[PDB]
Amino acid sequence: KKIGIFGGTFDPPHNGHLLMANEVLYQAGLDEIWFMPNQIPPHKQNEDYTDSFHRVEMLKLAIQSNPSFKLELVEMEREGPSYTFDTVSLLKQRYPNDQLFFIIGADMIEYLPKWYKLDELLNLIQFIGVKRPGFHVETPYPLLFADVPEFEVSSTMIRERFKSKKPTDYLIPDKVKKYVEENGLY
Amino acid sequence: KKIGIFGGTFDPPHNGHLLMANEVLYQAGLDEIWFMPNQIPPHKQNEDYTDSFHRVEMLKLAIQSNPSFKLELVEMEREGPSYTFDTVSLLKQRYPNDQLFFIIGADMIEYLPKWYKLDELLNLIQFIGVKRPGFHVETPYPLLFADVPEFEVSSTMIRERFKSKKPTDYLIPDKVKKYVEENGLY
Ligand SMILES: Nc1ncnc2c1ncn2[C@H]1O[C@H](COP(=O)(O)OP(=O)(O)OC[C@H]2O[C@@H]([n+]3cccc(C(=O)O)c3)[C@H](O)[C@@H]2O)[C@H](O)[C@@H]1O
Ligand SMILES: Nc1ncnc2c1ncn2[C@H]1O[C@H](COP(=O)(O)OP(=O)(O)OC[C@H]2O[C@@H]([n+]3cccc(C(=O)O)c3)[C@H](O)[C@@H]2O)[C@H](O)[C@@H]1O
């Protein structure tokens, strides 16, 4: 079972995610994409990253309509900063017969260096890069690519959008927008 | 009444369209965007557009959920190649008290020169340029700009996608995908 782990803090989740996952899904020839949400984002524990419960909620709304997208709360499986090396380690254990790939966008590609235990991690799983507008890939690390239309949208956009009351339409599912307004986020 | 005429042949209409329009609507402080479908695309009369009726049908689906998006079939009422001069002329007559702006993406911007009566049209109404990924703005014509998130997605993408059965999800309203599938398009 060829699976693509798509970790992210999704605060909030937006179309850009949906499109990349859905495109990587096809391009890397995967069976299902796994949206894995951080308990507490490793690279940002000093940034004020929404309570998790709302992230997993917003996440569930953004991916319901796609049969091939599946939630994965394995990192929510208990306390401490969610370091991919630790998680992937664990995952390769629960699912030893499945083919696993991790997915990141241009953005993170630039961050590979600052990233806990990347040299051990890269040995565990293979990485798939996409290419996000504004950032750019180039890494000196083993990484496979997947052509994916560039879509300029990041959560931080929406958050500011959602606070200065700017559009946010056609950038996040109409379901995710409501949850935010409803549950008072951003 | 501040209006942004958003002409296109929309074959098919896609999120890129929806996104740009909804942004320009904000960025240029307009009251509503008018999606204006060609009867027969001026700049490509020897290609294949799809009979129109479907373009208007697909167009109608894409913009239903947005109260500020409106359909304008003015060009559909009177035969022959839909030249923006002729039309904007007429428009500036039916609506003498409303503020009218036209809208194009980097795509069209590059094309301003090969464009029936630009010099006289430019006199009639003000254009608002966006910027599409792949193309790029630079023109020697009087044009205003509206910052709008780059979204690399074209109808010609979809058409090919919809015919080599590739994803198309998250690129066109799901209502638009159905119409195509049901009505045997592309
Ligand atoms: N338009 C777009 N086109 C393509 N991708 C886009 C995108 N907008 C956001 N994305 C991003 O969406 C995904 C994730 O969303 P987002 O919430 O922004 O992701 P983010 O919070 O920045 O972090 C990405 C993941 O990498 C892991 N990480 C990060 C840093 C350090 C370490 C470590 O162990 O040391 C691990 C962790 O699992 C995290 O969930 C991809 O990472 C991608 O970069
Ligand atoms: N991702 C994206 N980001 C921003 N904009 C994007 C876009 N993808 C498509 N678009 C385009 O969508 C809009 C229209 O859709 P589309 O079907 O592609 O538009 P298109 O068929 O290329 O032509 C644009 C409009 O210009 C007029 N025109 C064109 C050529 C010659 C003459 C003449 O007077 O001789 C007149 C005509 O009224 C038409 O409605 C904008 O033109 C924009 O460029």
Curated annotation (Swiss-Prot), chains A, B:
Does the record carry Ribonucleoprotein as a key word? no
Question: Which pathway?
Answer: Cofactor biosynthesis; NAD(+) biosynthesis; deamido-NAD(+) from nicotinate D-ribonucleotide: step 1/1
Query: What Gene3D superfamilies has UniProt attached to this entry?
Result: HUPs
Name the Enzyme Commission number(s) assigned to this protein: 2.7.7.18
The chemistry this enzyme catalyses reads: nicotinate beta-D-ribonucleotide + ATP + H(+) = deamido-NAD(+) + diphosphate
Q: Name one GO biological process term.
A: NAD biosynthetic process
For this protein, the record's InterPro entries field holds: Cyt_trans-like (IPR004821), NadD/NMNAT (IPR005248), Rossmann-like_a/b/a_fold (IPR014729)
The entry assigns this protein to a family as follows: Belongs to the NadD family.
- Which NCBIfam families does the UniProt entry name for this protein? cyt_tran_rel, nicotinate (nicotinamide) nucleotide adenylyltransferase, PRK00071.1-3, PRK00071.1-4
Physiological role: Catalyzes the reversible adenylation of nicotinate mononucleotide (NaMN) to nicotinic acid adenine dinucleotide (NaAD).
The protein's name is Nicotinate-nucleotide adenylyltransferase
